[PDB]
Design a protein around this ligand. Structure first.
Ligand SMILES: COc1ccc(Cl)c2c1C(=O)C(=O)N2
Ligand SMILES: [Zn+2]
Length: 140
């Protein structure tokens, strides 16, 4: 589990979004596994605005923060899960690393701030949904 809190926005895995998130929906994309909802309280996270391909992510299944090299956001074939059929997920970044059930929502960060959230895993890889292209998270 996990979310990003920036301005009056909450960013979660679409597949983990709550009743309150869907009621207070700003924006969602099934193909990216993202949902953004409105919040009452101001958040403290900063979104990275960069093309960094190195960072640190939190892995809840190991209680550890791993330094990683990750691919640029791309269309990536993702095997069927309990949440989606086998499909192309867009704006996805891959790294060699641990990702198991309960790891989705872990934050990936670089020197500039939040890059994205754990969205996929298996076969010794971890996939992260990029948020750096969502410039509107910084305003309104
Ligand atoms: C599409 O959702 C997933 C696919 C693969 C893996 Cl390992 C996952 C998830 C999660 O939600 C999670 O916590 N671990
Ligand atoms: Zn960066």
């Amino acid at each position: 589990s996990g979310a990003i809190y920036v301005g009056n926005y909450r960013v979660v895995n679409r597949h983990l979004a709550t009743h309150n998130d869907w009621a207070n929906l700003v924006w969602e994309d099934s193909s990216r596994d993202l949902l953004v909802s409105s919040t009452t309280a101001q958040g403290c996270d900063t979104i990275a605005r960069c093309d960094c391909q190195t960072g640190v992510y939190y892995c809840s299944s190991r209680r550890k923060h791993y330094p990683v090299s990750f691919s640029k956001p791309s269309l990536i074939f993702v095997e069927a899960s309990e949440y989606y059929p086998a499909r192309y997920q867009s704006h996805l970044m891959l790294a060699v690393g641990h990702s198991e059930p309960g790891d989705c929502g872990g934050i990936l960060r670089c020197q500039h701030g939040v890059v994205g959230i754990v969205s996929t895993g298996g076969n010794g890889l971890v996939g992260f949904a990029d948020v750096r292209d969502l410039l509107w998270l910084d305003e309104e």
